Amino acid sequence: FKFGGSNVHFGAGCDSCGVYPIIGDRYRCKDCKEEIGYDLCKDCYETPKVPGRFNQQHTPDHRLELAR
Amino acid sequence: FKFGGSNVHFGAGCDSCGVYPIIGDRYRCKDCKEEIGYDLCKDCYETPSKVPGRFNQQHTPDHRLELA
Numbered sequence: 016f017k018f019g020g021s022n023v024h025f026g027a028g029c030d031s032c033g034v035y036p037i038i039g040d041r042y043r044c045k046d047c048k049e050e051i052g053y054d055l056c057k058d059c060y061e062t063p064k065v066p067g068r069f070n071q072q073h074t075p076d077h078r079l080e081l082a083r
Numbered sequence: 084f085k086f087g088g089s090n091v092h093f094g095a096g097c098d099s100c101g102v103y104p105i106i107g108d109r110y111r112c113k114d115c116k117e118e119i120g121y122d123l124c125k126d127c128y129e130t131p132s133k134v135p136g137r138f139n140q141q142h143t144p145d146h147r148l149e150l151a
């Protein structure tokens with residue numbers, strides 16, 4: 016069981032705006048390798064391109080997936 | 084960014100033992116469409132068991148679980 020479903024992502028924060036936890040849809044990078052990962056809120060996914068809050072090497076060619 | 088990576092799953096609990104949050108690997112159901120979802124910890128996963136779920140999940144042995 017997961018409380019909130021995909022409406023809330025505890026422990027996950029947006030690497031552009033810094034909201035924590037991400038409320039609503041979350042877009043996770045799949046090619047960024049750092050274990051901290053790279054995530055975006057739906058607003059920052061829609062209006063795009065920060066390099067990262069924690070030294071993540073996110074490139075414009077990286078692909079993002081919706082995290083259910 | 085997500086703290087703890089795949090070593091902790093905040094907001095996610097095991098439907099067999101009830102641990103919350105799930106520490107370690109987590110297995111989520113692809114076919115259970117209840118918003119609460121269906122999840123299991125790794126030891127409970129690898130010891131197969133009847134676990135219909137704790138929140139009215141209609142989880143059948145035919146349902147498939149993916150590592151999250």
Ligand SMILES: [Mg+2]
Nearest residue numbers: 101102103104
């Ligand atoms: Mg607890």
Ligand SMILES: [Zn+2]
Nearest residue numbers: 029032056059
């Ligand atoms: Zn954002």
Ligand SMILES: [Zn+2]
Nearest residue numbers: 044047073077
């Ligand atoms: Zn990336």
Ligand SMILES: [Zn+2]
Nearest residue numbers: 097100124127
């Ligand atoms: Zn368990």
Ligand SMILES: [Zn+2]
Nearest residue numbers: 112115142146
């Ligand atoms: Zn199921």
